[PDB]
Amino acid sequence: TYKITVRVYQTNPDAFFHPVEKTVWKYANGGTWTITDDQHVLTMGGSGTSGTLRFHADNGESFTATFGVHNYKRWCDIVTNLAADETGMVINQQYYSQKNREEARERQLSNYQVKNAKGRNFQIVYTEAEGNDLHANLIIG
Amino acid sequence: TYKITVRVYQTNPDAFFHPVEKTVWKYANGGTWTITDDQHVLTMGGSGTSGTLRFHADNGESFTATFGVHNYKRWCDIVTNLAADETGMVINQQYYSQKNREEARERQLSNYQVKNAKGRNFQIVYTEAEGNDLHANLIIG
Ligand SMILES: CC(=O)N[C@@H]1[C@@H](O)[C@H](O)[C@@H](CO)O[C@@H]1O
Ligand SMILES: CC(=O)N[C@@H]1[C@@H](O)[C@H](O)[C@@H](CO)O[C@@H]1O
């Protein structure tokens, strides 16, 4: 089993994001998104799968944060500027079919940040980046 | 916009189900799964999409409950006895690719029930079953 426990930090009162979708990819016997003490917990059956959280703000901004384990190490990626047909389940699957997404996954990043077209920054940092009980902060700018 | 507000009723203390995944299909400008007063709310950009909730009990049982709108009329379906590679996002997409699932959607049911292999009943009943503001009970036996 691998577990990724995500704490969401919102740093910027000019918006408020909330989770609108939580998906689990089918490899490695799948897994679950649960909630413990306000943290999003992705539990997976082994290495090689992942799960996507999609967040939406009132003003129409949105992003996906995806977390998983590739070759026994954590990975993460953020996709923003989402098209109206890019739901979380679309994004999640693309990590196993679309080359640019596959490559992002295979980099096994413990830390990644990117901005949307409005200039808002989004960041994932694993504070526990080793072993089977992984912990990450999702930091919204 | 179409909205489907879902109330979950668990009636049998021999199990406890909890939501482990919530997906939104890409058609009709997608949508969101939000929470209001312990109710799961699927808000969709128009007719022709859906979203899936997957529930797991710690005794191993699981199922998906899918809710959507097809040619302006609500639909629903439940899939039980899930394989370990049948996550909610796999199931949700099957309503637009796998014949038996497409047919279930096309039925435009205001209510649907099915039992799993252990004999547990699962039912969806739309108590507000017309118009753009739809309300459904998900009743676990
Ligand atoms: C602005 C934006 O969302 N860029 C994303 C990038 O962060 C991500 O690594 C990628 C591959 O999945 O596709 C996009 O380039
Ligand atoms: C036991 C069980 O899950 N049966 C289902 C049924 O509920 C359903 O509507 C369908 C089409 O999606 O697939 C399966 O036949």
Residue numbers in the entry:
A (entry chain B), B (entry chain A): 1 to 141
Q: What do the study authors state?
A:
Sclerotium rolfsii lectin (SRL) is a cell wall-associated developmental–stage specific lectin secreted from the soil–born pathogenic fungus. SRL displays a clear specificity for TF and its substituted glycan structures. In the current study we report two recombinant variants SSR1 and SSR2, generated by the deliberate changes of the amino acids incorporated at particular sites of SRL by the synthetic gene construct method based on the complete amino acid sequence of SRL.
In both the SSR1-GlcNAc and the SSR2-GlcNAc complexes, determined at 1.9 Å and 1.7 Å respectively, GlcNAc was found bound only in the secondary carbohydrate binding site of SRL in agreement with the complex of GlcNAc with SRL. In the SSR1-GlcNAc structure an MPD molecule was found bound in the primary carbohydrate binding site similarly to the SRL-GlcNAc complex structure. The rms displacement values for all atoms upon superposition of the SSR1-GlcNAc and the SSR2-GlcNAc structures onto the SRL-GlcNAc structure are 0.5 Å and 0.4 Å, respectively. The structural mode of binding of GlcNAc does not differ significantly in the variants and the SRL structure. Briefly, GlcNAc is involved in hydrogen bond interactions with residues Asp77, Ile78, Thr80, Arg101, and Tyr112.
